[PDB]
Enzyme design. Sequence first.
Site, PDB file in Angstrom:
ATOM      1  N   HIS A 133       0.807  -1.219   0.000  1.00 44.72           N
ATOM      2  CA  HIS A 133       0.000   0.000   0.000  1.00 44.72           C
ATOM      3  C   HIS A 133       0.842   1.272   0.000  1.00 44.72           C
ATOM      4  O   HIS A 133       0.299   2.359  -0.234  1.00 44.72           O
ATOM      5  CB  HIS A 133      -0.955   0.029   1.206  1.00 44.72           C
ATOM      6  CG  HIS A 133      -1.957  -1.088   1.204  1.00 44.72           C
ATOM      7  ND1 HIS A 133      -2.835  -1.293   0.161  1.00 44.72           N
ATOM      8  CD2 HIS A 133      -2.222  -2.054   2.114  1.00 44.72           C
ATOM      9  CE1 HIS A 133      -3.588  -2.348   0.423  1.00 44.72           C
ATOM     10  NE2 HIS A 133      -3.228  -2.835   1.597  1.00 44.72           N
ATOM     11  N   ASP A 171      -2.403 -10.931  -2.017  1.00 43.72           N
ATOM     12  CA  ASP A 171      -3.031 -10.313  -0.856  1.00 43.72           C
ATOM     13  C   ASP A 171      -4.471  -9.945  -1.209  1.00 43.72           C
ATOM     14  O   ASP A 171      -4.769  -9.583  -2.346  1.00 43.72           O
ATOM     15  CB  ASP A 171      -2.220  -9.071  -0.457  1.00 43.72           C
ATOM     16  CG  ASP A 171      -2.679  -8.440   0.844  1.00 43.72           C
ATOM     17  OD1 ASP A 171      -3.750  -7.804   0.859  1.00 43.72           O
ATOM     18  OD2 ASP A 171      -1.945  -8.557   1.847  1.00 43.72           O
ATOM     19  N   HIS A 173      -6.157  -7.436  -0.563  1.00 39.98           N
ATOM     20  CA  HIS A 173      -6.319  -6.017  -0.848  1.00 39.98           C
ATOM     21  C   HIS A 173      -5.531  -5.632  -2.095  1.00 39.98           C
ATOM     22  O   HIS A 173      -4.504  -6.235  -2.419  1.00 39.98           O
ATOM     23  CB  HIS A 173      -5.856  -5.146   0.330  1.00 39.98           C
ATOM     24  CG  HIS A 173      -6.528  -5.477   1.631  1.00 39.98           C
ATOM     25  ND1 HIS A 173      -5.948  -6.285   2.588  1.00 39.98           N
ATOM     26  CD2 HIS A 173      -7.748  -5.134   2.119  1.00 39.98           C
ATOM     27  CE1 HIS A 173      -6.768  -6.412   3.616  1.00 39.98           C
ATOM     28  NE2 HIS A 173      -7.866  -5.718   3.361  1.00 39.98           N
ATOM     29  N   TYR A 304      -3.694 -12.165   8.825  1.00 40.59           N
ATOM     30  CA  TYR A 304      -3.824 -11.817  10.235  1.00 40.59           C
ATOM     31  C   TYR A 304      -4.339 -12.927  11.132  1.00 40.59           C
ATOM     32  O   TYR A 304      -4.348 -12.740  12.353  1.00 40.59           O
ATOM     33  CB  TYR A 304      -4.715 -10.569  10.384  1.00 40.59           C
ATOM     34  CG  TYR A 304      -4.177  -9.475   9.491  1.00 40.59           C
ATOM     35  CD1 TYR A 304      -3.075  -8.738   9.879  1.00 40.59           C
ATOM     36  CD2 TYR A 304      -4.700  -9.263   8.214  1.00 40.59           C
ATOM     37  CE1 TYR A 304      -2.528  -7.780   9.055  1.00 40.59           C
ATOM     38  CE2 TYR A 304      -4.167  -8.292   7.378  1.00 40.59           C
ATOM     39  CZ  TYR A 304      -3.081  -7.557   7.806  1.00 40.59           C
ATOM     40  OH  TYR A 304      -2.521  -6.595   7.000  1.00 40.59           O
TER      41      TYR A 304
END
Length: 356
Positions: A133, A171, A173, A304
Amino acid sequence: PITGLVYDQRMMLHHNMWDSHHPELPQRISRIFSRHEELRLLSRCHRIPARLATEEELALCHSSKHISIIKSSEHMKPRDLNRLGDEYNSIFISNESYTCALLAAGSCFNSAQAILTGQVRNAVAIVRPPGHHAEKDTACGFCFFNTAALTARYAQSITRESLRVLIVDWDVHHGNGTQHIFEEDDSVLYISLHRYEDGAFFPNSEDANYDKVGLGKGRGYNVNIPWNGGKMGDPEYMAAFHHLVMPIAREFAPELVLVSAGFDAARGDPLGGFQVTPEGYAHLTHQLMSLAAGRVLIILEGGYNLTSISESMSMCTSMLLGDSPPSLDHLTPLKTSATVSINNVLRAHAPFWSSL
Ligand SMILES: C[C@H](NC(=O)[C@H](CC(=O)NCC(C)(C)C)NC(=O)c1ccc(C(=O)NO)cc1)C(=O)NCc1ccccc1
Ligand SMILES: [K+]
Ligand SMILES: [K+]
Ligand SMILES: [Zn+2]
């Protein structure tokens, strides 16, 4: 053929001073590392040393101001760390954050170097904080410097400027930073699969849609595979790889493959809401190994659920080491919205990739 592994416990020092239970935990990398030891994967790898990235290396992708600000956090008081973290979207910062970000990038530099110089065939990097990001000029989404993008530029700097690098970002995202860094570049093909939800999923931008195909000479070298409408898993990821990722990747003919390997699309993730299984990630890894003479570097991004990411990344390392891919479940028929997504991406990228 040798698999390399890099891990440094010092990357555990970056932490959230406001909430000790924030899911981007130091224990993400120590749990993954411990699982590699328990499964006797660690001892089968060549151990690649970690190192700090240099600021000249950070400047391959990031502005002088961004580097200076994050570097200054090493010496800030708690009140200033809190105020600095609030200047970004979804960032926490401690006095150790900058060093950990340098270690994550420098570890990947050493691994790419080991791959490119022929010391290892492929490699896995168990690193945090994550990278994809992070933008040229700003931190975002738990990322300070864009480790994967920096590693692509570092690889080019130690070989030739036109070295063809594929970045596959699985990922859950969108790697907004990686897309923007390479948006106008035809030497770095960026392929991201990500939960999109018509823009209602972090990082909340329409830049992640399938119609963002790149700019200028980079047109066609940005492939967004956005998922909408609920929980995707092995069938959808295998289909996207079969019909999109691998045909485009073979036509591009990369010399180096970097995997932005977040495991937050994994079954059990509290944030991603998807159900890719560890065997699914093994099959994705095994497909990428058929590219670039096997020169594949797997870089931890998000993920996570401590147990899910430990099993998932260990399965990737087992594939890199040459173990046989495990049997997948009976793959249920593709979800309707995933068929829509694949059709949209094919239509958007057919002008650029004759193999589609
Ligand atoms: C409200 C909104 N919330 C977030 O952005 C949360 C922040 C957080 O930490 N929440 C705690 C929680 C993680 C337990 C949910 N972040 C993420 O959901 C997230 C998850 C995974 C990854 C990742 O990297 N996966 O790999 C990155 C980011 C928010 O802050 N707007 C603030 C803003 C300012 C300025 C402009 C726009 C917006
Ligand atoms: K992604
Ligand atoms: K690109
Ligand atoms: Zn993520």
